[PDB]
Amino acid sequence: EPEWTYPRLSCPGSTFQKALLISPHRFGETKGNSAPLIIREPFIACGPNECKHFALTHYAAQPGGYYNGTRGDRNKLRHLISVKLGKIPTVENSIFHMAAWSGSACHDGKEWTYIGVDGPDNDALLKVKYGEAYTDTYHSYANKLLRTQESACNCIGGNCYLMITDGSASGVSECRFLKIREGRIIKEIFPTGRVKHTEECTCGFASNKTIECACRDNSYTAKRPFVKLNVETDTAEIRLMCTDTYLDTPRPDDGSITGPCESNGDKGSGGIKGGFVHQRMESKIGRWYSRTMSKTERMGMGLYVKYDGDPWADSDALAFSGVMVSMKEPGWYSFGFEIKDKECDVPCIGIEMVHDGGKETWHSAATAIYCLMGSGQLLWDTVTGVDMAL
Amino acid sequence: EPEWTYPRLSCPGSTFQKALLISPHRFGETKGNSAPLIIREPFIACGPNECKHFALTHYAAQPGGYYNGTRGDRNKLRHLISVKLGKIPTVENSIFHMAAWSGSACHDGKEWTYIGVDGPDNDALLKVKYGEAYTDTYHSYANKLLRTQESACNCIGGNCYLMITDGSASGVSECRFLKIREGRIIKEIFPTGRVKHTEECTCGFASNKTIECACRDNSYTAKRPFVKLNVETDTAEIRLMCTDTYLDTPRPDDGSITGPCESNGDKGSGGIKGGFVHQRMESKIGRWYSRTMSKTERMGMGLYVKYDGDPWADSDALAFSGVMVSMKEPGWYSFGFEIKDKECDVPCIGIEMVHDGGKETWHSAATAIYCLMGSGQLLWDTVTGVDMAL
Amino acid sequence: EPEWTYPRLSCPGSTFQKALLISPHRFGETKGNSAPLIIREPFIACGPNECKHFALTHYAAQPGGYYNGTRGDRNKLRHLISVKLGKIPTVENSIFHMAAWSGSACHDGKEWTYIGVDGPDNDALLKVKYGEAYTDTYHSYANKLLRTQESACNCIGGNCYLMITDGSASGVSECRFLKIREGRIIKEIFPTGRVKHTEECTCGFASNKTIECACRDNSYTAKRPFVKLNVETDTAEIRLMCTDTYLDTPRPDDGSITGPCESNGDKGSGGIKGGFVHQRMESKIGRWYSRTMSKTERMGMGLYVKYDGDPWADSDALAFSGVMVSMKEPGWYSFGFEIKDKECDVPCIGIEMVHDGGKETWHSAATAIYCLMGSGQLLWDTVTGVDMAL
Amino acid sequence: EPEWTYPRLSCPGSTFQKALLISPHRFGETKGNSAPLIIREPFIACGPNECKHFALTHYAAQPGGYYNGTRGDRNKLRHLISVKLGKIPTVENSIFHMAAWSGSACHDGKEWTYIGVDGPDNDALLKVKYGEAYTDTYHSYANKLLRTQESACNCIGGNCYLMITDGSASGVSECRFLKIREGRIIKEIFPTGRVKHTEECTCGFASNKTIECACRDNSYTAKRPFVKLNVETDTAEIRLMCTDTYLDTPRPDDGSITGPCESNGDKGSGGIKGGFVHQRMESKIGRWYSRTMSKTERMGMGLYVKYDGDPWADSDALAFSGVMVSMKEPGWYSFGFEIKDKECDVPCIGIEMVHDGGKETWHSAATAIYCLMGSGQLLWDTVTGVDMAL
Ligand SMILES: *[C@@H]1O[C@H](CO)[C@@H](O[C@@H]2O[C@H](CO)[C@@H](O[C@@H]3O[C@H](CO)[C@@H](O)[C@H](O)[C@@H]3O)[C@H](O)[C@H]2NC(C)=O)[C@H](O)[C@H]1NC(C)=O
Ligand SMILES: *[C@@H]1O[C@H](CO)[C@@H](O[C@@H]2O[C@H](CO)[C@@H](O[C@@H]3O[C@H](CO)[C@@H](O)[C@H](O)[C@@H]3O)[C@H](O)[C@H]2NC(C)=O)[C@H](O)[C@H]1NC(C)=O
Ligand SMILES: *[C@@H]1O[C@H](CO)[C@@H](O[C@@H]2O[C@H](CO)[C@@H](O[C@@H]3O[C@H](CO)[C@@H](O)[C@H](O)[C@@H]3O)[C@H](O)[C@H]2NC(C)=O)[C@H](O)[C@H]1NC(C)=O
Ligand SMILES: *[C@@H]1O[C@H](CO)[C@@H](O[C@@H]2O[C@H](CO)[C@@H](O)[C@H](O)[C@H]2NC(C)=O)[C@H](O)[C@H]1NC(C)=O
Ligand SMILES: CC(=O)N[C@H]1[C@H]([C@H](O)[C@H](O)CO)OC(C(=O)O)=C[C@@H]1NC(=N)N
Ligand SMILES: CC(=O)N[C@H]1[C@H]([C@H](O)[C@H](O)CO)OC(C(=O)O)=C[C@@H]1NC(=N)N
Ligand SMILES: CC(=O)N[C@H]1[C@H]([C@H](O)[C@H](O)CO)OC(C(=O)O)=C[C@@H]1NC(=N)N
Ligand SMILES: CC(=O)N[C@H]1[C@H]([C@H](O)[C@H](O)CO)OC(C(=O)O)=C[C@@H]1NC(=N)N
Ligand SMILES: *[C@@H]1O[C@H](CO)[C@@H](O)[C@H](O)[C@H]1NC(C)=O
Ligand SMILES: *[C@@H]1O[C@H](CO)[C@@H](O)[C@H](O)[C@H]1NC(C)=O
Ligand SMILES: *[C@@H]1O[C@H](CO)[C@@H](O)[C@H](O)[C@H]1NC(C)=O
Ligand SMILES: [Ca+2]
Ligand SMILES: [Ca+2]
Ligand SMILES: [Ca+2]
Ligand SMILES: [Ca+2]
């Protein structure tokens, strides 16, 4: 009988290793007989019994005749879809949850909560689904472009916390947090501090008390806005990550942003969503981060880690841990998630490896997974193995 | 060990929103690898654990070579099929329930009842299936064309109520209601009042005591016949909806029908099945309706609502809630259904969007879904995104 | 904690009606994207929860490159497959049970028993499978061609009864009966009486005391051999069906066999497996049968019935019930089976509808189902809808 | 509550028979509509409820455009996949467990354990997954090529025993055995005795206290290294099996290795994974093995058996029990596994039948299965039925 889930101590390990590649378009060739879905913004969320691989589809397949428009972000056909992790997301394997061009999902211990935003840009609408039922909505508040995480929300004892943001992509987007219980929004949380631009937060539990998020600023800085949300008081605060190892793309050179922690620096315009995930141990906390190998291009994906300290106040360079995607291969969005073992949580990072060939052809993605696994060093990189010409 | 289901209070909300689109022919192009089934008359029915998406297939897929005859209404190949709502209705995903060119289905809390009418026009036959087992039949009583709802029947305390009808499409069709329990017919019900012509009723619970249906008159009027069925006494009465906002297609201008409520008016010839769903509150009853945007063509679909009053007596215009499907897009049959949240019911309306290219090509449909969901105004419309040329 | 099944009283009804068509080759065209399996000798068996549609595949699909051989009876590639009844039996939907060119299956209330015969003609081997495990075997005793029912075996209190036979197609073929429990052969039953040729028995439960079988004589008579098997004392007895309505194909004109009951007669060479099922009542026993509409060809299928009496002694013509398949459509093997309702058993007859374009193209079959359904008369026939040039 | 599994006494039987063929490429022709996965190194492992069919895929299908490399051993794309035994392993039916170019799997009665080694040749990494969660890793020790069984590991009382090996392919490869419990390596076992080269062990339980393995020597001999592992003491000893029937391929003539039991002999270069499975009886143990028909080539597959005695000491030829695959057909890797019947275990051997047509086209395999079944002699051989040109 189902009880509410809580974050547990992470399971023992000291390094990440290549775990699993989901590359649907390995079967999408004209010579083939398969129907992989055209997608982007994939993420993974796990419940006590099952892991689900989510994505936003353009409601089209490779091969097919609806490639035109699959390079855009929003339209009336896009849908949040999923399969069990390990299954290839095809037309028939997938299930279509709801229309959305921005999404999230999380399992609270008893049931799946699905999140989907669609509607017109100036008045977008977030929709909440608990299992099969549509249960709530939330309205755009800045009337620019209401949007959400493109990664998993976080549930503790029945309460599910979700980042949403609204505002200009090149101007101001003040983010908020929805608290959602059994499909219904029961509280809005307004963060304090450096709030001028926060989008596409990647969140997780530092403990039973605190959720932390590494987010994206699309205008002002190449440093990641770092949220600290206390779930006991339902309050949040945002300051920029102090580490010399700037995680955004585009970014400047490491350390080159001189001055105090809060200094915005150069190359702030533009952005990318970043992997972030906690390794909780008895007396220390590990924070793992991913960023592209290239400073200005969505190419490659490397892994970093730092134990304890305060991300807001520490200049310290993050320890480079290894290359997950070499700079020759595409490396786009990345997200954190946790797999539930018998008595312990297993932190992972998934990486969106987009197949980009311009607007003249199809535009989709593969997903690579790296998980905390044993000891030593990260050993192997990941390729998609897709020839976009076929 | 499940209990019989009963209609519950509706979930909180005050507006409908775009929820989900099932457009299987987005994957029916020649350079694709999918086999979506060719169907029409789709509808949805929900049990306590699952929503099923039903339709009548022509036992043929796109791409395929059996297009010829997919624009006819009846033949020896048509079958009632279903998939789990959210899955694409393909050859492999679908399950074939029974031979039928007219159908319904509903869950009683324990098991599925599947209804499927087939046979020669002059002597058609209704078939009842309970789970896997064929359990009963009902013979033609007017010998013109026995037929049924093309949407979900309704169960309360293990008793399922089903509308059937038989008669000319341009003359008298005096409908009846069957009371079906565990797959077997236990009582016929003969409605009184205005029984000239009643077909393809879209029914639902107004309360524990009353079932209401918004039906179709294909011969005499563009006002929808309105059934009130007392499930405590198993009697039914029918009168025409009095509202100025005529729901049928074709129809004259709104309010144009001079004279009192019972006035049949002009443009009675023809018709279309219309969406109808209840929003049950503690102290009021909300009635949600859909109708085409075009006055004469099966094009577009708009949403409407009025709270309480007597549908038989009120000439009051229905409130316009929004455009679910614009007039640029096809809008055919519509239906009501209810999704089961943990403690309350969620009213929804489905829209059949037919792909009509004429007799020389394939003839099928997509399904769009809107549901009561939060507050405010209906925000976005639905397109199928299908080019029939591919 | 589950329990053995026993035959129950058949459930109310007085006529059969068209239920379900499984016609996978409707989707097997060259311009399609489906993969129906190529099969023959299909049958259906039902346990307490689901029905399974079994067949013998040639391990090849349509469209495909392996049409050569699909009109042959035995080879090293043939397997017994199934799907849940309602599903299209394709490459991906089907499950492969074991190598076999002759088969049977039945559920005892706890688990499925799968029967499969393969091997060389003069030393064939019957193989039994219980759940996932291979459990027993039986050897050729005549060294001509060991073979079995090609339809459901019959289980009572955990004991399952299966007909096998060994011998020449144009000579002696003395069948035996295996009593099987939980995958293992516990007893052999040697039938007394008219035993010179008995094959492809279609069997059902007349009572808790008696199994009856309508079988096929391929060399001596156009009357069908009829088995009476006493499951209480494990003894079997065979005599020819005395009825003027000769059920084999080919056959002489009805009644035209001159002599007493045991009289063999003319046109005894050739034969076909025939449908036969019991309608059990407290009052009386109904016996439904099926035979081709043509006397000399596998064309059409007619439904017949006599209530009570002794088919060993009664020469009276069986009552014609209706045409399940017209003489314009193919009509091959037919089989009996019973779907389990909550309280009652529903008798059905399935009809293999073979697509026969000769040995230069593919060779497979559709399945049509008719079940006892309500009262009145049988109303509609079944067509496959398949054009073999597509 | 689910308890730990232990080996049980074997099911009654005297001989193996052809059970099942899995040949996915029968449906891989260019004029078809299916997508069989391209694989090699298949094996099978069963738990209390289900058997799974594993393999190592090249992440490509037939037909498709990624054949280049499919004859390769290791790359960054290979993955451990599985379907339920009985299902065709296609793109859609299969589940992707983890990246791997060497694998293993087993069920301990509660949960599955999946083994997958990947990484650089020189610093390879073994990965352990328990259900959904990656739980442990193990590093290369000889830094030459860490690798594992490519067949089922073995679980008793929740303790899973698995063979790993590292070192030269033409020199020393000293193996180790891991004790894995609920996904974690709790003990390593260092074997004594003859240990210069042992790889690709096929292991099974000989009792509740002894596991035996028939392994491969790719460098020094054509006799198979034979591991004995005491699971009570957690110690293992390895000596070459002495029988004159050399099970390796390539091999010299039977008996031609002159000398005492421990002598190496000629033609010890090269190797093949070989079949081995126990038949456990009351006061007797059976030992079934398989080896190729050709002495030099990977063609054909014969079955051999011997009861009791010591494989370390006994020189006598194994009793030839029949041809499973004729020398005209491909016979590559073979492996042992056991199916769990209700009260006993059924021994089987699986055979990899590689479709080899060189480096310029696809490279994959079918899986053939023979199991202990009844009495007498092994009756029929297995062909794939695949024409590589189609
Ligand atoms: C966050 O809070 C949750 C809930 O308080 C913590 O999990 C709880 O504490 C321990 C986790 O190790 C569990 O104790 C165990 O009890 C079971 C019997 O239920 C027993 O088998 C074990 O030997 C152990 O004593 C406790 O049950 C568990 N409670 C729930 C409701 O899950 C969690 O550890 C906290 N996370 C932190 C501190 O990072
Ligand atoms: C229509 O009639 C049915 C039949 O009585 C009504 O269903 C009943 O609804 C009540 C509350 O509305 C349920 O009571 C609740 O039971 C749960 C435990 O099951 C308990 O935790 C709650 O505190 C509450 O007492 C009752 O169980 C339920 N019975 C059945 C058989 O469903 C239904 O409410 C009526 N719908 C209307 C009036 O709109
Ligand atoms: C063949 O013999 C078996 C004996 O096992 C008969 O099965 C039995 O059928 C009777 C029919 O009335 C069942 O009685 C019922 O029991 C249920 C218990 O839930 C009760 O609610 C009903 O009111 C009724 O009394 C009986 O349970 C059943 N036995 C078993 C073990 O299931 C079967 O009917 C015989 N076949 C014939 C007569 O054709
Ligand atoms: C090996 O050990 C297992 C575990 O004790 C034995 O399995 C038992 O078998 C008996 C029947 O002989 C059952 O009544 C017990 O319930 C079984 N125990 C468990 C835990 O399943 C097995 O018989 C032993 N002997 C062998 C394999 O020869
Ligand atoms: C709602 C929305 O359109 N989000 C965009 C997002 C956005 O353009 C920027 O972050 C700026 O606000 O970035 C792009 C992107 O890949 O950079 C993906 C997202 N596309 C989708 N989620 N569909
Ligand atoms: C049984 C039957 O053929 N019902 C018809 C329906 C019917 O003609 C009208 O209700 C008037 O009598 O028209 C509609 C329609 O599209 O208008 C299609 C239906 N097609 C199917 N349900 N198959
Ligand atoms: C085991 C076997 O080969 N059975 C044959 C069967 C047989 O040839 C005759 O009955 C004569 O004994 O008839 C033919 C047939 O359709 O007439 C189909 C069967 N084909 C298969 N079951 N494979
Ligand atoms: C890990 C690994 O690559 N194992 C090899 C194996 C190996 O080369 C020899 O056993 C010598 O060490 O050869 C066999 C083989 O087919 O001979 C295939 C294996 N391929 C894979 N398992 N991928
Ligand atoms: C379609 O079927 C009808 C009726 O069977 C037939 O008259 C017509 O010629 C067919 N059309 C084509 C294009 O074959
Ligand atoms: C057809 O099948 C027979 C059966 O063995 C075989 O001899 C023949 O060569 C086959 N022909 C082709 C073209 O495959
Ligand atoms: C296969 O790939 C290799 C590189 O890995 C390349 O050199 C070779 O030409 C390729 N083969 C073909 C036929 O393209
Ligand atoms: Ca930035
Ligand atoms: Ca009208
Ligand atoms: Ca005959
Ligand atoms: Ca060797």
Side-chain angles (χ1 to χ4, degrees), chain B residues 40-41 56 72-74 78 101-102 145-147 150 167-169 197 199-200 216 218 271-272 298 332-333:
Chain B
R40 254 208 73 210
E41 304 82 35
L56 304 180
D73 295 308
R74 298 172 306 276
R78 299 201 79 183
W101 37 253
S102 184
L145 185 63
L146 185 66
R147 59 205 185 265
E150 330 293 359
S168 170
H197 187 115
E199 68 178 3
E200 293 183 336
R216 163 183 173 175
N218 196 67
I272 197 174
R298 296 186 166 183
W332 286 51
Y333 273 15

Short mmCIF file of all heavy atoms in Angstrom, two decimals, chain B residues 40-41 56 72-74 78 101-102 145-147 150 167-169 197 199-200 216 218 271-272 298 332-333, ligand 6:
data_model
loop_
_atom_site.label_atom_id
_atom_site.label_comp_id
_atom_site.label_asym_id
_atom_site.label_seq_id
_atom_site.Cartn_x
_atom_site.Cartn_y
_atom_site.Cartn_z
N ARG B 40 -14.46 6.32 -37.80
CA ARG B 40 -15.29 7.48 -37.52
C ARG B 40 -16.09 7.23 -36.25
O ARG B 40 -15.94 6.18 -35.62
CB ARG B 40 -16.20 7.85 -38.69
CG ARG B 40 -15.74 9.09 -39.45
CD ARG B 40 -16.90 9.84 -40.11
NE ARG B 40 -17.70 10.54 -39.12
CZ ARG B 40 -19.00 10.78 -39.22
NH1 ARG B 40 -19.67 10.38 -40.29
NH2 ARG B 40 -19.62 11.43 -38.25
N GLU B 41 -16.94 8.19 -35.89
CA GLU B 41 -17.73 8.13 -34.65
C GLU B 41 -16.91 7.78 -33.39
O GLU B 41 -17.23 6.83 -32.68
CB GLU B 41 -18.91 7.16 -34.79
CG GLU B 41 -19.85 7.46 -35.96
CD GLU B 41 -19.35 6.91 -37.29
OE1 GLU B 41 -18.73 5.82 -37.29
OE2 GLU B 41 -19.57 7.57 -38.33
N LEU B 56 -15.53 3.35 -34.35
CA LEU B 56 -15.98 2.37 -35.33
C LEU B 56 -15.00 2.40 -36.48
O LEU B 56 -14.90 3.40 -37.20
CB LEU B 56 -17.38 2.71 -35.83
CG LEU B 56 -18.48 2.86 -34.78
CD1 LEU B 56 -19.83 3.19 -35.41
CD2 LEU B 56 -18.59 1.61 -33.90
N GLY B 72 -18.76 5.32 -46.49
CA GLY B 72 -20.09 4.79 -46.22
C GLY B 72 -20.29 4.64 -44.72
O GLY B 72 -19.33 4.62 -43.96
N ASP B 73 -21.54 4.54 -44.29
CA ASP B 73 -21.83 4.44 -42.87
C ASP B 73 -21.87 3.00 -42.37
O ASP B 73 -21.59 2.73 -41.21
CB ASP B 73 -23.14 5.16 -42.53
CG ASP B 73 -23.06 6.66 -42.78
OD1 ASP B 73 -22.12 7.31 -42.26
OD2 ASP B 73 -23.93 7.19 -43.50
N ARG B 74 -22.23 2.06 -43.25
CA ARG B 74 -22.45 0.69 -42.81
C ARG B 74 -21.89 -0.30 -43.80
O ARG B 74 -21.96 -0.09 -45.01
CB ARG B 74 -23.95 0.43 -42.60
CG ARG B 74 -24.58 1.30 -41.52
CD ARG B 74 -26.10 1.17 -41.47
NE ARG B 74 -26.74 1.43 -42.76
CZ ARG B 74 -27.06 2.63 -43.22
NH1 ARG B 74 -26.78 3.72 -42.52
NH2 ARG B 74 -27.66 2.75 -44.40
N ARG B 78 -17.20 -3.28 -40.49
CA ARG B 78 -17.03 -2.31 -39.41
C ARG B 78 -17.08 -2.93 -38.02
O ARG B 78 -17.89 -3.82 -37.74
CB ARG B 78 -18.00 -1.12 -39.53
CG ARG B 78 -17.79 -0.33 -40.82
CD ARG B 78 -18.35 1.08 -40.73
NE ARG B 78 -17.45 1.98 -40.00
CZ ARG B 78 -17.75 3.25 -39.73
NH1 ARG B 78 -18.91 3.76 -40.12
NH2 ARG B 78 -16.89 4.01 -39.07
N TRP B 101 -21.56 -1.30 -36.67
CA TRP B 101 -21.53 0.00 -37.35
C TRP B 101 -22.25 1.08 -36.54
O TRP B 101 -22.46 2.20 -37.01
CB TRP B 101 -22.06 -0.08 -38.79
CG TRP B 101 -23.21 -1.01 -39.06
CD1 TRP B 101 -23.16 -2.21 -39.71
CD2 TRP B 101 -24.59 -0.80 -38.72
NE1 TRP B 101 -24.42 -2.76 -39.79
CE2 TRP B 101 -25.32 -1.91 -39.19
CE3 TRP B 101 -25.28 0.22 -38.07
CZ2 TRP B 101 -26.70 -2.04 -39.02
CZ3 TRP B 101 -26.66 0.10 -37.89
CH2 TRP B 101 -27.35 -1.03 -38.37
N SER B 102 -22.58 0.75 -35.31
CA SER B 102 -23.15 1.72 -34.38
C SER B 102 -22.83 1.19 -32.98
O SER B 102 -22.93 -0.02 -32.75
CB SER B 102 -24.66 1.84 -34.59
OG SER B 102 -25.23 2.84 -33.77
N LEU B 145 -33.94 1.23 -39.40
CA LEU B 145 -32.50 1.18 -39.08
C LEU B 145 -32.21 1.30 -37.58
O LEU B 145 -31.97 2.39 -37.08
CB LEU B 145 -31.71 2.25 -39.85
CG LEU B 145 -30.19 2.19 -39.67
CD1 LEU B 145 -29.64 0.87 -40.21
CD2 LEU B 145 -29.50 3.36 -40.33
N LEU B 146 -32.21 0.17 -36.88
CA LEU B 146 -31.84 0.14 -35.47
C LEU B 146 -30.42 0.69 -35.31
O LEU B 146 -29.53 0.33 -36.08
CB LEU B 146 -31.90 -1.29 -34.94
CG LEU B 146 -31.64 -1.49 -33.45
CD1 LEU B 146 -32.75 -0.84 -32.66
CD2 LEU B 146 -31.53 -2.96 -33.12
N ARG B 147 -30.22 1.57 -34.33
CA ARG B 147 -28.95 2.26 -34.13
C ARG B 147 -28.87 2.82 -32.71
O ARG B 147 -29.87 2.82 -31.99
CB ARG B 147 -28.76 3.38 -35.16
CG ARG B 147 -29.85 4.46 -35.14
CD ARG B 147 -29.97 5.14 -36.51
NE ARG B 147 -30.90 6.26 -36.54
CZ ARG B 147 -32.17 6.18 -36.91
NH1 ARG B 147 -32.69 5.02 -37.29
NH2 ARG B 147 -32.94 7.27 -36.91
N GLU B 150 -23.51 6.25 -30.28
CA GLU B 150 -22.16 6.65 -30.70
C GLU B 150 -21.47 7.50 -29.63
O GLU B 150 -20.66 8.38 -29.94
CB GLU B 150 -22.16 7.37 -32.06
CG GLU B 150 -23.27 6.97 -33.02
CD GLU B 150 -23.16 5.55 -33.54
OE1 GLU B 150 -22.20 4.84 -33.16
OE2 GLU B 150 -24.04 5.13 -34.32
N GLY B 167 -35.99 3.89 -37.11
CA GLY B 167 -36.93 4.62 -37.94
C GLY B 167 -36.20 5.35 -39.04
O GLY B 167 -34.96 5.33 -39.12
N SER B 168 -36.97 6.01 -39.89
CA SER B 168 -36.43 6.74 -41.03
C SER B 168 -35.57 7.92 -40.60
O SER B 168 -35.80 8.53 -39.55
CB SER B 168 -37.57 7.23 -41.93
OG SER B 168 -37.08 8.12 -42.92
N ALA B 169 -34.58 8.25 -41.43
CA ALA B 169 -33.68 9.36 -41.14
C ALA B 169 -34.36 10.67 -41.48
O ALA B 169 -33.90 11.74 -41.07
CB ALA B 169 -32.39 9.21 -41.93
N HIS B 197 -38.96 12.23 -33.37
CA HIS B 197 -37.65 11.79 -33.84
C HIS B 197 -36.57 12.11 -32.81
O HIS B 197 -36.34 13.28 -32.47
CB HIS B 197 -37.32 12.44 -35.19
CG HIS B 197 -36.06 11.93 -35.81
ND1 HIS B 197 -36.05 11.24 -37.00
CD2 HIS B 197 -34.77 12.01 -35.41
CE1 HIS B 197 -34.81 10.91 -37.31
NE2 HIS B 197 -34.01 11.36 -36.36
N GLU B 199 -32.51 10.77 -32.05
CA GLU B 199 -31.38 9.89 -32.33
C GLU B 199 -30.06 10.40 -31.76
O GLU B 199 -29.91 11.60 -31.47
CB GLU B 199 -31.22 9.64 -33.83
CG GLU B 199 -30.80 10.87 -34.62
CD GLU B 199 -30.62 10.57 -36.10
OE1 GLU B 199 -30.87 9.41 -36.52
OE2 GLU B 199 -30.21 11.48 -36.85
N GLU B 200 -29.13 9.47 -31.59
CA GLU B 200 -27.75 9.76 -31.20
C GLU B 200 -27.64 10.65 -29.98
O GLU B 200 -26.98 11.69 -30.02
CB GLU B 200 -26.99 10.37 -32.36
CG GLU B 200 -26.80 9.40 -33.50
CD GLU B 200 -25.99 10.00 -34.61
OE1 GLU B 200 -25.98 11.25 -34.70
OE2 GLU B 200 -25.35 9.24 -35.37
N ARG B 216 -30.36 14.36 -31.27
CA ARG B 216 -30.38 14.86 -32.63
C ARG B 216 -31.72 14.56 -33.30
O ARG B 216 -32.23 13.44 -33.22
CB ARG B 216 -29.23 14.23 -33.41
CG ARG B 216 -29.33 14.32 -34.91
CD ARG B 216 -28.16 13.58 -35.57
NE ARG B 216 -28.32 13.51 -37.02
CZ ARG B 216 -27.41 13.02 -37.85
NH1 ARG B 216 -26.26 12.55 -37.38
NH2 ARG B 216 -27.64 13.00 -39.16
N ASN B 218 -32.99 14.53 -37.03
CA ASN B 218 -32.51 14.60 -38.40
C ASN B 218 -33.60 14.97 -39.41
O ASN B 218 -33.31 15.24 -40.58
CB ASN B 218 -31.85 13.27 -38.79
CG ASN B 218 -31.01 13.38 -40.05
OD1 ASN B 218 -29.98 14.05 -40.05
ND2 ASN B 218 -31.44 12.72 -41.11
N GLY B 271 -28.75 16.85 -39.61
CA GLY B 271 -28.39 16.92 -38.20
C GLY B 271 -26.96 16.54 -37.92
O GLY B 271 -26.18 16.25 -38.83
N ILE B 272 -26.62 16.53 -36.63
CA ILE B 272 -25.28 16.18 -36.20
C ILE B 272 -25.31 15.87 -34.70
O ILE B 272 -26.09 16.47 -33.95
CB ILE B 272 -24.24 17.29 -36.52
CG1 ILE B 272 -22.81 16.74 -36.45
CG2 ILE B 272 -24.40 18.49 -35.60
CD1 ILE B 272 -21.77 17.73 -36.88
N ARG B 298 -20.23 21.22 -41.43
CA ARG B 298 -19.58 20.58 -40.29
C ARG B 298 -18.17 21.15 -40.12
O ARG B 298 -17.17 20.46 -40.29
CB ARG B 298 -19.57 19.06 -40.46
CG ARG B 298 -20.97 18.47 -40.46
CD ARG B 298 -20.97 16.96 -40.48
NE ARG B 298 -22.30 16.45 -40.15
CZ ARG B 298 -22.62 15.17 -40.02
NH1 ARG B 298 -21.70 14.23 -40.20
NH2 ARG B 298 -23.87 14.82 -39.71
N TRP B 332 -16.95 17.81 -36.53
CA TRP B 332 -18.05 16.90 -36.82
C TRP B 332 -18.81 16.49 -35.55
O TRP B 332 -19.37 17.35 -34.86
CB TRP B 332 -17.56 15.69 -37.61
CG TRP B 332 -17.25 16.01 -39.06
CD1 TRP B 332 -16.46 17.02 -39.53
CD2 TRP B 332 -17.72 15.30 -40.22
NE1 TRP B 332 -16.42 16.99 -40.91
CE2 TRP B 332 -17.18 15.94 -41.36
CE3 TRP B 332 -18.54 14.17 -40.41
CZ2 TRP B 332 -17.44 15.51 -42.66
CZ3 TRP B 332 -18.80 13.74 -41.71
CH2 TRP B 332 -18.25 14.41 -42.82
N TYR B 333 -18.84 15.20 -35.25
CA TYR B 333 -19.50 14.72 -34.05
C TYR B 333 -18.83 15.26 -32.80
O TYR B 333 -17.62 15.45 -32.78
CB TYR B 333 -19.51 13.19 -34.00
CG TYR B 333 -20.69 12.59 -34.71
CD1 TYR B 333 -21.45 13.35 -35.58
CD2 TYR B 333 -21.06 11.26 -34.50
CE1 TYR B 333 -22.54 12.82 -36.23
CE2 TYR B 333 -22.15 10.71 -35.15
CZ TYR B 333 -22.89 11.50 -36.01
OH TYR B 333 -23.98 10.99 -36.66
C1 LIG E 6 -26.25 3.84 -38.21
C2 LIG E 6 -25.71 4.99 -39.00
O1 LIG E 6 -25.42 4.82 -40.17
N1 LIG E 6 -25.53 6.28 -38.38
C3 LIG E 6 -24.96 7.48 -39.21
C4 LIG E 6 -25.80 8.66 -39.06
C5 LIG E 6 -27.27 8.42 -39.39
O2 LIG E 6 -27.45 8.34 -40.75
C6 LIG E 6 -28.10 9.56 -38.82
O3 LIG E 6 -28.15 9.38 -37.45
C7 LIG E 6 -29.51 9.66 -39.39
O4 LIG E 6 -30.28 8.51 -39.39
O5 LIG E 6 -25.30 9.77 -39.85
C8 LIG E 6 -23.95 10.13 -39.32
C9 LIG E 6 -23.47 11.28 -39.85
O6 LIG E 6 -22.24 11.40 -40.12
O7 LIG E 6 -24.26 12.23 -40.05
C10 LIG E 6 -23.03 8.90 -39.50
C11 LIG E 6 -23.60 7.69 -38.89
N2 LIG E 6 -22.73 6.46 -39.27
C12 LIG E 6 -22.53 5.36 -38.35
N3 LIG E 6 -22.93 5.45 -37.09
N4 LIG E 6 -21.96 4.28 -38.78
#
